[PDB]
């Protein structure tokens, strides 16, 4: 049974996972930008009458309201999720502490110090 080679494999897979996470985040950013360009259409309104200005403005206001509504919904969702994450993280930490802290101590800190003092 080799252990140093296992350590090499561990560190190398750690590096590979780091690189994969980097490239995956990069792809995520690219897809986010692409989808953002896809969904929010750009509009050009040069040399237009004021009536078209009113129409575009009102549509934009309605879209603003809708987007803020969706942001409110997803924000409530995220707040609830974060609350659950904090609670469950605390619970799992308590479980781990129960399992492990009974095994933490300072062994032989001064026991070996008693040689010939008596």
């Amino acid at each position: 049974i080799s252990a140093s080679r296992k350590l090499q494999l561990k560190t190398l897979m750690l590096q590979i996972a780091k690189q994969e996470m980097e490239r995956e985040a990069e792809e995520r950013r690219g897809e986010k930008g692409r989808v953002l360009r896809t969904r929010c259409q750009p509009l050009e309104l040069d040399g237009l009458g004021f009536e078209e200005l009113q129409d575009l403005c009102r549509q934009l206001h309605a879209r603003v309201d809708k987007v803020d509504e969706e942001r409110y919904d997803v924000e409530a969702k995220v707040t609830k999720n974060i609350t659950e994450i904090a609670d469950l993280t605390q619970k799992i930490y308590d479980l781990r502490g129960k399992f492990k802290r009974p095994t933490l101590r300072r062994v032989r800190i001064s026991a070996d110090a008693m040689m010939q003092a008596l």
Partner: protein, 160 residues
């Protein structure tokens, strides 16, 4: 490898003098300067803290890769400071969680033999048939046929 050469390079003569004082009993004379690892068992016990005998043999056989059976003072230095804690902080817990999430690309919350197999195959590293089963024991700590969060965390415990 020479990674721990750099690791031991951090400590200057301040610990070198103490190490030479400890090693002077190792060089007790009547020797041709070979300096084997015979006393190393108690040399690592010079201050009391001594690791597993298996780790002691791993350190012994690991260094002196030429097989000369000669203990370089640099080799003894790095092996005795290896008794001292030496780690690169083992990444980050959030970072490790992201790493396991990437590992759990199946989003199942578990990694089987195939998941880890593909994970390391993507690295391209040669892995023996004598391995894999070793990795099976290392990962499947619960003997449940999968790799869990605690099992992964122990598997990646402070490794960098």
């Amino acid at each position: 490898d020479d990674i721990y050469k750099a690791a031991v390079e951090q400590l200057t003569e301040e610990q070198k003098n103490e190490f030479k004082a400890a090693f002077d009993i190792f060089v007790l004379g009547a020797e041709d300067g070979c300096i084997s690892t015979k006393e190393l068992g108690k040399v690592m016990r010079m201050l009391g803290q001594n690791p597993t005998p298996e780790e002691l043999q791993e350190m012994i056989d690991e260094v002196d890769e030429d097989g000369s059976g000669t203990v370089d003072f640099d080799e003894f230095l790095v092996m005795m400071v290896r008794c001292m804690k030496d780690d690169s902080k083992g990444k980050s817990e959030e970072e490790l969680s992201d790493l396991f999430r990437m590992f759990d690309k199946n989003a199942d919350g578990y990694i089987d033999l195939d998941e880890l197999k593909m994970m390391l195959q993507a690295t391209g590293e040669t892995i023996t048939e004598d391995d894999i089963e070793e990795l099976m024991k290392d990962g499947d700590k619960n003997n449940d046929g999968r790799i869990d969060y605690d099992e992964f965390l122990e598997f990646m415990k402070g490794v960098e």
